[PDB]
Amino acid sequence: QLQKQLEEANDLLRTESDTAVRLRKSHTEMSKSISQLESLNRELQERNRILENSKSQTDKDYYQLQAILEAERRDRGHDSEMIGDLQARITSLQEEVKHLKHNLEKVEGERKEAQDMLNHSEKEKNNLEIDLNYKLKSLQQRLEQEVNEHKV
Amino acid sequence: SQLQKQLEEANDLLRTESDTAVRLRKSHTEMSKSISQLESLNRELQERNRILENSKSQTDKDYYQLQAILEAERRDRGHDSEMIGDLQARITSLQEEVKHLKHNLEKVEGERKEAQDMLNHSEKEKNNLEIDLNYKLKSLQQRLEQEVNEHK
């Protein structure tokens, strides 16, 4: 009868106030978890902020070494210009040497011919002087030998 | 009809209770959404970190490659500098060979000129001598033979 109807509402009202205790326990554990998670996510957010700046710093250091590389290259470039100009100057000097040598030779040849002509002129003139000297004296001797023939 | 009011309490409570059992079933589904979205953000945040750490690490590797390019290419500058010195030496030798040839050419051409002058003096001295004597001998000879003939 009703004794079986209240013995039911008994077991039911029990499990209800029972599972209400379990829900309250459920909810105090989820309060505790979401609070520890809010304090953890705060940490991961900060390690990330740090990572980011870290990576951005690594970038700057890379770029900075590139800038140094591109300056080196700019200098190695001036060395190649310089080497090029020394080589060109060398080439020019060499052909100048060649040319001057060839001129030396030629002028040296012309000096020789000149000296040959000079020598011949001097010898020819010398022969003349030697000849005239003896012959003129030979005239003066022949006249002397007549004068002195009758000197008493 | 007094206990009928007690069944108005119970009825009314089994509705306020059946109602907060539905506000819960909804609350819990709204929370299992948040938590699912947090899991999302969390996998995303973890992804960025991974990419960050990887991009950062590839940059470190590239940095060391870059440094190696600097060292390698800086050897080719030690050689460039040794060359510039050698070509600078080859150039001073040549500038001297030129200085010396230019000198020799000036002298050898001086010698030529002088030999040409001496030759012109020499020919002039001789031909003046020959001309003068020729004239003086003519008169002396004629007048002697004016007499050698007036003998007969």
Author numbering:
A (entry chain A): 542 to 693
B (entry chain B): 541 to 692
What does the paper say about this structure?
ROCK is able to regulate the phosphorylation of myosin light chain (MLC) by direct phosphorylation and by inactivation of myosin phosphatase through the phosphorylation of its myosin-binding subunit (MBS).
Most interestingly, the charged head group of Arg-617 inserts into the center of the coiled-coil interface and together with Glu-613 and Asp-620, it appears to push apart the two helices. The coiled-coil is bent by about 14° in the region centered around E613/R617/D620, where the inter-helical distance is also at its maximum. It is tempting to speculate that the E613/R617/D620 irregularity destabilizes the coiled-coil, effectively creating a hinge that allows the coiled-coil to “jackknife”.
